[PDB]
Design a protein around this ligand. Structure first.
Ligand SMILES: CC(=O)N[C@H]1[C@@H](OC[C@H](N)C(=O)O)O[C@H](CO[C@]2(C(=O)O)C[C@H](O)[C@@H](NC(C)=O)[C@H]([C@H](O)[C@H](O)CO)O2)[C@H](O)[C@@H]1O
Lengths: 204, 198, 120
């Protein structure tokens, strides 16, 4: 089962349709158990508001919201049973609340002396309160692009301003850290006409 | 109908993962379904199996109205949240199972100091701990606005690392003290790390 | 090879409308997001709006939300910015750019010449 789109951004009030290409539909909010939402293609489960509906047949099914509500933001998984006895889920579609474009605020943090005394340097790049979710973070050490030595994590959509935040950590040995001068993180986002670079010099 | 999962949340690799589900309705399909960190759902099996796992995978006991999952020779890829369910209409709460060789270790808390508009960012890096979770507060709970505590990442060392940041007015960097309070119960470690500008 | 040519700007009264267009040449614009930005003489280029690929919706800046609308014609390989309830604060050179990254990270490598919109 292939779900389209992977991520759906909708304003409160839009008609929204999630397609399952090849029906059962489950809703899941972050951290909670999946709940049966629309079973047998179009039957609404207990507690499901009337704005939800299901349609489709054969190789194409769809879940439809007449008027998007804020509480409808969640992951939606389609699930099928085949009788080779197999119970298969789809990759799920995230239905998020759309807001206005906000470019991230970029900050950089050099490693502390405490961590350097242990032989490791962690440089942290923060992208604060941006939307939409898509962005790109590139680590550059003396203009050399880093690869395979960073890890990032992203918060859930903020319940107040509907933005995302991203934290990226570049980890090096103290020796490799002292072998270079300029440490920078370069951020690209659709709200930016040109990439934003935040950098520092190791000695300063 | 109510289903509840129980069992250990930490199993060593190549050992056995055993989970019990207590079931409001009789057992005469009842499924085990897991969700990976990547949020992919996978049906494992049912008792009244998925070919991807049939070689190492479910029993039942009617005296206490429980059915059980047995997964042998676990690897780190088996780290997941496990749910028991009746068909697809009633799901359990789910239990997180971490498959790791790591041992309990408290975290190191390093400062992310603010330096050179009117908004500054600072925080704390909580690095090299095991297992999940840690909790982070700011100024003993007095500072919550602008706080972002990120999900932990699993490093190649097998230890977790996360960051907790907060944005503040720049003019407050000389007048307001900022302390992050990190708590890691499995190691009984508690750190109050002061973040001073550079 | 890619080239972008914007058109449709001009002198308009406060509270009226405009339909700016941008034509793409030497490459198809069907697999990439097209983004409108704008610049005042002594300022920097601020994002105005973005239209992703078809069925991937559009997004807008806060200063133009509800008043502006972005759309695409993949057949004519063109993008369009409809501007309603124009205020004098919208007076700028409007540029169009192509996001080269299919994952919508906005690798803005190709830009147009821009068209002057003055509202008075
Ligand atoms: C009232 C109600 O919700 N009825 C459902 C339910 O009916 C159950 C039936 N009366 C029974 O006790 O057997 O479920 C129906 C779906 O039934 C299947 C299916 O064919 O899809 C039976 C399969 O054997 C089962 N497979 C497994 C591995 O459990 C699947 C599966 O449970 C679901 O696909 C999970 O979502 O359900 C039908 O939905 C009725 O409306």
């Amino acid at each position: 089962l292939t779900q389209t789109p992977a991520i759906m951004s909708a304003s409160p009030g839009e008609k929204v349709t999630l397609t399952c290409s090849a029906m059962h539909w489950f809703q899941q909010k972050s951290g909670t158990s999946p709940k049966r939402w629309i079973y047998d293609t179009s039957k609404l489960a207990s507690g499901v508001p009337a704005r939800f509906s299901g349609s489709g047949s054969g190789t194409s099914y769809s879940l439809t919201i007449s008027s998007m509500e804020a509480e409808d933001a969640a992951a939606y998984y389609c699930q099928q049973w085949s009788s080779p006895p197999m119970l298969t889920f789809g990759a799920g579609t995230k239905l998020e609340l759309k807001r206005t474009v906000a470019a991230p605020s970029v900050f950089i943090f050099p490693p502390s002396d405490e961590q350097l005394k242990s032989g490791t340097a962690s440089v942290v790049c923060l992208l604060n309160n941006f939307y939409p979710r898509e962005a790109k973070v590139q680590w550059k050490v003396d203009n050399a692009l880093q690869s395979g030595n960073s890890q990032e994590s992203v918060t859930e959509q903020d319940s107040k301003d509907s933005t995302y935040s991203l934290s990226s950590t570049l980890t090096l040995s103290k020796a490799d850290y002292e072998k270079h001068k300029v440490y920078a993180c370069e951020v690209t986002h659709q709200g930016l006409s040109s990439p934003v670079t935040k950098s520092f010099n190791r000695g300063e | 109908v109510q289903l509840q999962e129980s069992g250990p949340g930490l199993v060593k690799p190549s050992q056995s993962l055993s989970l019990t589900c207590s079931v409001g309705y009789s057992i005469t399909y009842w499924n085990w379904i897991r969700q990976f960190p990547g949020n992919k759902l996978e049906w494992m099996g049912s008792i009244n199996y998925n070919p991807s796992l049939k070689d190492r995978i479910i029993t039942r006991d009617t005296s206490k109205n429980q059915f059980f999952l047995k997964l042998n020779s676990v690897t780190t890829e088996d780290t997941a949240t496990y749910y028991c369910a009746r068909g697809g209409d009633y799901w359990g709460q789910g239990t997180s199972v971490t498959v790791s060789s790591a041992s309990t270790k408290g975290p190191s808390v390093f400062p992310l100091a603010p330096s050179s508009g009117g908004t500054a960012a600072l925080g704390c890096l909580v690095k090299d701990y095991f297992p999940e979770p840690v909790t982070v507060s700011w100024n003993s709970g007095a500072l919550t606005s602008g706080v972002h505590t990120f999900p932990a990442v699993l490093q190649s060392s097998g230890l977790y690392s996360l960051s907790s940041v907060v944005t503040v007015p720049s003019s407050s960097l000389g007048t307001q003290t900022y302390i992050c309070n990190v708590n890691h119960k499995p190691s009984n470690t508690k750190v109050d790390k002061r973040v001073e500008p550079k | 090879x890619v080239q972008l040519x914007x058109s449709g700007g001009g002198x308009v009264q406060x509270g009226x409308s405009l339909x700016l267009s941008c034509x793409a040449x030497x490459x198809x614009x069907x697999x990439x997001x097209x983004x409108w930005x704008r610049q005042x003489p002594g300022x920097x280029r601020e994002x105005v709006x973005x239209x992703x690929x078809x069925x991937x919706x559009x997004x807008x800046x806060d200063s133009x939300x509800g008043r502006f609308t972005x759309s695409x014609d993949x057949x004519x390989x063109x993008x369009x910015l409809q501007x309603x309830x124009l205020x004098x604060x919208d007076x700028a050179x409007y540029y169009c750019x192509x996001x080269x990254x299919x994952x919508x990270x906005x690798x803005x490598x190709x830009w147009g010449x821009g068209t002057x919109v003055t509202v008075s």
